[PDB]
């Protein structure tokens, strides 16, 4: 009776109270002029929280939930609302975009509630909202509301269990690579959940989303410490390649000029014969917003990523020198997995070809040739060694390689054969798979089966020859 705060912080405790609040919140997202009435809403919420003595913690949570429910196309008003409310750390705002400050500042109470709600994936109802909730936290986690490490250190899968799963995956992969497994074709066909958990939620899912939403520095700083994490899932490499490809595209168009040839991507007009005369019309499509990152066009309508300013913090390259300087950061992280995205190989190789062709006359050509030799040795060739029955990418990489002295090509090929096949895990796995497949095909060459075995052998030899 003397030292308790006399406040009601569970929904059923002060029903009327929370009722009003949450109803009001829905109103704010169904208001066309909601953007110019932020202050009136904040004053209303304070008036209510005062009248029936709601708590601060639980009310912050109630705001977060029914906000995340509308986050797609509400994020603008949502962020303005939180920006003007006094639950916003104003004198110690977190940065999240500077290596020296990934753990200083924020609003630690919001950090507690968020790190809590991100570890509940046991019931069946939250498994369908984890996506939107993670997206709302990823939005908040780059405007400085909370610092990153305060979230990273406290989500469910502890670092030790992660490392154990990593060692298990490493050993299983190395064994299935070196030894290999016999796929049963007609063998014995006659006579006479925690893995899904680690993959689908918690730290890994947070990393994937922090990558999608254009916040690259936290994930760079994490993968700088634990590289093995890339073995857990493939999608990290694809998303990193997405941000790098957007970074490089405008430099790539400036060379190998396709802008003059950009004016040929148009659709056929719908033509129809009415009253015995031709009539042309344009096709009509509509635009939808979803949470999937890659655009598409499903047969009548075009889907796009909702958070349309995810590329605000990044600046494309202006000169090939910047391409080197940022390769040394992004490509040295993506590693031998660059092969998972062939298009990047083609883009970098065409940039190289055009850069070498630009100064065929000048005296300094040998300088650029040496520098591109080193680059292709260190970043691209290990990647192209990973491909799977994809000739054209190797054709491009070799179309760039054609400019070197053959001594250098033999150097690269032999080093790749002797020192980098061994002593690197994913390369070793790919080489062993290709070799076993080549022997399997070689045992089945005949004068009668050449019609298809020839095509298969040609693809396999063209993709990963040496």
């Amino acid at each position: 009776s003397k030292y308790e705060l006399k406040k009601y912080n569970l929904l059923v405790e002060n029903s009327v109270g929370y009722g009003q609040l949450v109803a009001l919140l829905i109103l704010a997202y169904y208001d066309p002029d909601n953007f110019s009435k932020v202050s009136a809403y904040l004053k209303e919420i304070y008036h209510i929280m005062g009248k029936y003595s709601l708590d601060s913690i639980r009310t912050l949570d109630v705001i977060l939930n029914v906000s995340s429910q509308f986050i797609t196309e509400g994020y603008k008003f949502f962020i303005a609302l939180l920006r003007k409310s006094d639950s916003w750390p104003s004198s110690h705002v977190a940065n999240n975009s500077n290596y020296s400050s990934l753990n200083e500042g924020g609003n630690m109470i919001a950090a507690n509630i968020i790190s809590f709600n991100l570890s509940q994936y046991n019931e069946e109802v939250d498994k369908e909202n984890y996506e939107r909730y993670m997206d709302m936290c990823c939005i908040l986690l780059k405007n400085g509301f909370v610092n990153f490490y305060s979230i990273w250190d406290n989500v469910k899968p502890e670092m030790e269990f992660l490392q154990e799963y990593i060692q298990n995956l490493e050993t299983e992969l190395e064994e299935e690579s070196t030894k290999g497994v016999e796929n049963p074709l007609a063998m014995a066909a006659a006579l006479s959940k925690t893995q899904q958990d680690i993959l689908l939620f918690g730290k890994i899912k947070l990393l994937e989303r922090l990558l999608i939403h254009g916040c690259v520095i936290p994930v760079i700083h994490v993968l700088k410490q634990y590289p093995k994490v890339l073995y857990v899932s493939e999608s990290l490499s694809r998303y990193l390649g997405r941000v790098f490809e957007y970074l490089l595209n405008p430099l790539y168009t400036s060379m190998t000029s396709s802008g003059e040839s950009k004016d040929m991507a148009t659709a056929l007009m719908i033509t129809r014969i009415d009253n015995g005369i031709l009539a042309h019309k344009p096709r009509l499509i509509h635009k939808y917003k979803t949470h999937e990152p890659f655009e598409s066009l499903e047969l009548n309508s075009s889907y796009v990523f909702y958070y349309s300013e995810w590329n605000s913090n990044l600046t494309p390259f202006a000169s090939v020198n910047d391409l080197f300087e940022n390769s040394h950061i992004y490509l040295s992280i993506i590693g031998p997995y660059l092969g998972r995205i062939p298009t990047l190989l083609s883009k970098i190789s065409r940039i190289g070809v055009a850069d070498i062709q630009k100064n065929h006359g000048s005296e300094s050509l040998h300088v650029t040739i040496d520098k591109w030799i080193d680059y292709v040795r260190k970043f691209i060739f290990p990647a192209t060694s990973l491909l799977q029955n994809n000739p054209i990418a190797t054709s491009e990489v070799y179309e760039l390689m054609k400019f070197f002295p053959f001594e250098k090509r033999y150097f690269i090929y032999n080093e790749m054969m002797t020192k980098l096949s061994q002593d690197i895990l994913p390369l070793k796995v790919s080489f062993n798979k290709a070799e076993r497949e080549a022997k399997s095909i070689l045992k089945a060459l005949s004068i009668d089966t050449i019609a298809k075995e020839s095509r298969r052998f040609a693809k396999l030899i063209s993709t990963n020859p040496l």
């Binding site: 208001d31 066309p32 148009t266 659709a267 344009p282 009509l284 499509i285 635009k287």
Partner: protein, 104 residues
């Protein structure tokens, strides 16, 4: 009175976005270069936009604006019908005859 004001404020703000009804969205583009249409950039013609905007004007009355809408509608019907009737008969006949003579 305060309760009435609050309830009517909710009714109003509810009535703009959610309970709204808009035009029919008949589409026609003149420019030949454009081949794909967003289907949301379609706006009404300025003549219609002004007549509509005069509804929420401070001093205007509804009846006069409704009359102006009727007049606009009749003008549109008349112009479209006149152009169609002119375009069909004479143009078809002359085009057919000239085409036959040109082929011969």
């Amino acid at each position: 009175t305060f309760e009435h004001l609050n309830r009517d404020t909710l009714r109003y703000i509810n009535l703009l976005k959610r309970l709204s009804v808009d035009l029919a969205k008949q589409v026609e583009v003149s420019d030949p270069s454009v081949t794909v249409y967003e289907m949301d950039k379609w706006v009404p013609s300025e003549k219609l936009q002004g007549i509509l905007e005069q509804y929420c004007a401070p001093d205007t009355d509804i009846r006069g604006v409704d009359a102006q809408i009727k007049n606009y509608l009749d003008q549109i019907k008349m112009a479209r019908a006149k152009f169609g009737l002119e375009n069909k008969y004479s143009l078809k006949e002359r085009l057919s005859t000239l085409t036959k003579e040109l082929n011969h």
